[PDB]
Amino acid sequence: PAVGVVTVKTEPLQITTELPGRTSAYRIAEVRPQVSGIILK
Amino acid sequence: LLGTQYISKQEYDQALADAQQANAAVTAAKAAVETARINLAYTKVTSPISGRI
Numbered sequence: 001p002a003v004g005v006v007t008v009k010t011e012p013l014q015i016t017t018e019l020p021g022r023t024s025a026y027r028i029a030e031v032r033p034q035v036s037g038i039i040l041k
Numbered sequence: 042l043l044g045t046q047y048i049s050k051q052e053y054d055q056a057l058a059d060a061q062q063a064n065a066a067v068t069a070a071k072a073a074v075e076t077a078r079i080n081l082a083y084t085k086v087t088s089p090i091s092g093r094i
Contacts, residue, residue, distance in 0.1 A: 038089045 042048045088094070
């Protein structure tokens with residue numbers, strides 16, 4: 001009986017959440033006419 | 042009336058005052074008139090562009 005052995009200790013682990021998501025500008029503005037009428041150009 | 046100094050330069054000032062502003066009121070008017078007329082121009086819808094309707 002001789003086996004490869006790895007004695008266990010405390011190992012700091014920074015592995016953490018890998019979770020979902022969607023992305024957005026910021027920077028996610030719009031252009032809304034504040035003056036009404038016909039678009040000339 | 043100011044040539045021979047028959048009024049008050051003050052007075053003439055006042056006269057020009059309205060005569061100044063008066064037309065401005067006119068300006069306030071013609072600006073006004075066009076406004077609605079413009080709307081009456083809005084009525085009778087103009088194609089803002091050209092092409093097949």
